[PDB]
Amino acid sequence: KVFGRCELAAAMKRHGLDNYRGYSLGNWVCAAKFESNFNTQATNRNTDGSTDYGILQINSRWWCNDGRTPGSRNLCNIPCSALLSSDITASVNCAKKIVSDGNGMNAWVAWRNRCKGTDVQAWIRGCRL
Ligand SMILES: [Cl-]
Ligand code: NA
C-alpha cells in the first residue's frame, strides 16, 4: 500500500508514535517519506547482504528474519515479510524498539540526512489529527 501523507500521520498517531521518545509526529512522517516514499512494500538490498523492509526500511541484520542474512539477530522477533503489510502495526512496534536502542532516530540514515534539523512540522500541516 502507498500511503497518503496525512493518512500515514493519522495511522502513526493512533499507534502511539507522536512524541514517542521525544520525536514529534513530523519526524516519523518525514522518515517514512524519504525511506520508502510511503510504500509499505519497499525493499532495498545492502552491500553486506542484508535487506531493508517496509515503510521505515527496517534492516534484516538486526531486527527481522528474512532467512538469507547469515548471523542476523531478529530483535523484533518477526519475519521481515510482516513489515511489508498494509497494516503498519508490525513496523511501528519494531521501530519503537529501534528508536529506544541508543542513537534514537539517527538509526535511519534518511532521517539523519534529510529530516534532522529541518522544519519537520511541515509534514503534518493541513492534516486532521
Ligand atoms: Cl533521542
Ligand atoms: Na535477522
UniProtKB/Swiss-Prot annotation:
Keyword vocabulary terms for this entry: Allergen, Antimicrobial, Bacteriolytic enzyme, Disulfide bond, Glycosidase, Hydrolase, Secreted, Signal
Family from the record: Belongs to the glycosyl hydrolase 22 family.
Gene3D superfamilies in the record: 1.10.530.10
Membrane-crossing segments per the record: none
Protein's recorded name: Lysozyme C
Subunit note: Monomer.
Reactions catalysed: Hydrolysis of (1->4)-beta-linkages between N-acetylmuramic acid and N-acetyl-D-glucosamine residues in a peptidoglycan and between N-acetyl-D-glucosamine residues in chitodextrins
Location(s), subcellular: Secreted
InterPro entries xref list: Glyco_hydro_22, Glyco_hydro_22_CS, Glyco_hydro_22_lys, Lysozyme-like_dom_sf
Residue numbers annotated as active site: E35, D52
Job description of the protein: Lysozymes have primarily a bacteriolytic function; those in tissues and body fluids are associated with the monocyte-macrophage system and enhance the activity of immunoagents. Has bacteriolytic activity against M.luteus.
